Design a protein around this ligand. Structure first.
Ligand SMILES: Nc1ncnc2c1ncn2[C@@H]1O[C@H](CSCC[C@H](N)C(=O)O)[C@@H](O)[C@H]1O
Ligand SMILES: Nc1ncnc2c1ncn2[C@@H]1O[C@H](CSCC[C@H](N)C(=O)O)[C@@H](O)[C@H]1O
Ligand SMILES: CC(C)Oc1ccc(-c2c[nH]cc2CN(C)CCN)cc1
Ligand SMILES: CC(C)Oc1ccc(-c2c[nH]cc2CN(C)CCN)cc1
Ligand SMILES: [Cl-]
Ligand SMILES: [Cl-]
Ligand SMILES: [Cl-]
Ligand SMILES: [Cl-]
Ligand SMILES: [Cl-]
Lengths: 333, 332
């Protein structure tokens, strides 16, 4: 079933997703400046924009002096990108090509590749293998990748929003004169007992320890394609700041653009301004009380599902202080 | 088999959290039940769709000697827990299964139910309640609520206006002109034939809201009239100059007094509720002026494939423009 790809691209054929991406100021301005600061590597050069969407990133490349930009797009939105390119008078420099980047035939190797491939938890959608497949095939030796690298972080969390949802049932008497405190367990089983990856914004005040980096993806490195199938991650460890009910873990990513100037980082940390990626939350089955200097440690692996390769899977093993090591397997909403 | 998937939606906590957190809804049901304490003292009540059991416990608190709390989804176990926890195991009996196939020991003096979906009739729970009235309600029995009215008005959704205008703003933000995508945006967002559940304010309302249906729930033969369609004709005149994006529909229900009668509205001129309003978009904007004639017909139906999903047939005419038709289905 390669018709699994048709239902994936149908999401990107609609305007709403692209509105959400372009409305994400942090994301779109990171790409704008990231491209601009690498003018030296881009003036006069050829560029491959993998998954051009509405074509905004391809136009940034042309505005930074690129002589030719190949904007490859697999969904029907390619029609709108051609229209936008034509509308800005850039048809002679920006050429939009339909179809997947795997099957696309360009007339030449390229000097640089740009792509916004990051999904939720970085690797939801599994777009990275397309980008790496295109690097190996089309990018010249020592050509520019934008962004050039990625890192993943994990940290234990106490989600205050969830806390109020669990506590809701104890507030019922004071409003309506009926005691529903006994449904606290039920709500915990409903909201924490399931095995889905929740994509939700957190505050920095919900963070219970130093965020630990558990993966580092240098996109130039050959053989990185093969490692994504086996999984991304490894062990983590940290000690908590204080007293709180730990609900689970959050994960987020960052990506780095090189300078020419200094490097630009695009982060999805809760200590930074929000993005449409938000954070990926991994809830325990029930809350666990931790104290100042409670040592939390464990193992995490990000990989694609068996059923749908584009869907993200997270295998977590964890140990909260004294407790026995527990396990939980998640899949994106 | 089809009905089992519907009940499963009410097995999760989130849906009941949302309903109980709707203070306008829950206070109206509390206060509506409390108003009829005289008629309910020492009487028996059926609670169709008991959920977590909160409405049954209002009836027991109001003085009913016996309440049968009927609930088809697995949440009946949570309703049993709450009853026992509140010490009302003698006065409230939680009976699992659908209300169609439940067996009570007696006929009841009153029926309470919160049955209203998005656009009132989404979910098609009203048939279950009307069947329960015929089978279990005594003569001169009480229905809470007792009636329902449906309203419609042309609207100018600001949230949509922002989303359509977005593509002209890209130049100012990022230095790339994408104003050429406005038509595409409109075709995606307005050309889809789905009923959008969204909250509006008073500024969004473009003319005097018009009632197009009344449902007296005691009326016999109403169950058959629901399958045929609930609806009517409407006409109104626009207040002033604005871009019309479609129609909003909403409802109200009325509890009898026993004191003045209590009205639970989901109008945008009254306090907000989880029902919000149900929006029916045109295929594109139509610019209107003061005293512009908007008229049409609306019919609320069950969908072809799925009887519990709400369908809306809309005929509409706006000013000099010819009469147009559009078929909507509730958000998938
Ligand atoms: N293998 C592949 N080949 C070509 N395009 C792909 C692809 N996999 C995903 N895409 C496309 O890549 C885009 C990812 S979203 C990024 C969109 C664009 N850069 C913007 O900022 O607006 C989508 O439009 C999707 O349809
Ligand atoms: N035919 C039927 N028989 C019994 N219960 C039904 C039913 N159709 C729907 N229901 C139930 O009716 C409920 C409607 S929601 C209202 C729940 C509750 N009265 C409250 O205010 O919180 C749902 O929980 C659903 O499971
Ligand atoms: C269809 C499933 C598997 O994939 C999607 C999940 C989410 C989205 C989505 C919703 N809003 C914005 C996006 C895209 N975004 C995450 C940046 C992409 N480089 C799209 C596809
Ligand atoms: C076909 C089914 C799934 O449609 C539903 C759609 C929405 C809901 C829902 C979400 N929050 C609250 C509700 C219930 N509410 C409308 C009051 C009902 N008496 C339930 C069923
Ligand atoms: Cl497509
Ligand atoms: Cl082109
Ligand atoms: Cl990085
Ligand atoms: Cl767990
Ligand atoms: Cl009414």
């Amino acid at each position: 079933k390669r018709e699994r790809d048709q239902l994936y691209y149908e999401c990107y054929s609609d305007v709403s997703v692209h509105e959400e991406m372009i409305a994400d100021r942090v994301r779109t301005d990171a790409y704008r400046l990231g491209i601009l600061r690498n003018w030296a590597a881009l003036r006069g050069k050829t560029v491959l924009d993998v998954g051009a969407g509405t074509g905004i990133l391809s136009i940034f490349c042309a505005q930074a002096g690129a002589r030719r930009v190949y904007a490859v797009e697999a969904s029907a939105i390619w029609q709108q990108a051609r229209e936008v390119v034509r509308f800005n008078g850039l048809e002679d420099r920006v050429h939009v090509l339909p179809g997947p980047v795997e099957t696309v035939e360009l007339p030449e190797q390229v000097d640089a590749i740009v792509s916004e491939w990051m999904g939720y938890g970085l690797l939801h959608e599994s777009m990275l293998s397309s980008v790496l497949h295109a690097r190996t095939k089309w990018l010249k030796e020592g050509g520019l990748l934008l962004p050039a690298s990625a890192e993943l972080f994990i940290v234990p969390i106490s989600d205050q929003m969830l806390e109020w949802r669990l506590g809701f049932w104890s507030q019922v008497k004071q409003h309506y004169g009926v005691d529903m405190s006994c449904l606290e367990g039920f709500a915990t089983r409903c909201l924490m007992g399931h095995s889905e990856i929740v994509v939700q914004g957190l505050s920095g005040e919900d963070v219970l320890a130093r965020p630990q980096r558990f993966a580092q993806l240098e996109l130039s490195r050959a053989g990185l394609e093969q490692e994504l199938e086996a999984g991304v991650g490894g062990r983590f460890r940290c000690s908590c700041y204080g007293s709180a009910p730990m609900h689970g873990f959050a994960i987020w990513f960052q990506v780095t653009f090189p300078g020419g100037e200094k490097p630009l980082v695009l982060s999805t940390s809760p200590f930074h301004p929000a993005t449409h990626w938000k954070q990926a939350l991994l809830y325990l089955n029930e809350p666990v009380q931790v104290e100042q200097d409670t040592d939390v440690s464990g193992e995490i692996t990000l990989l694609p599902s068996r059923d749908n390769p584009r869907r993200l899977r997270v295998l977590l093993r964890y140990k909260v202080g004294d407790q026995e090591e527990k396990t939980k397997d998640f899949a994106m909403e």
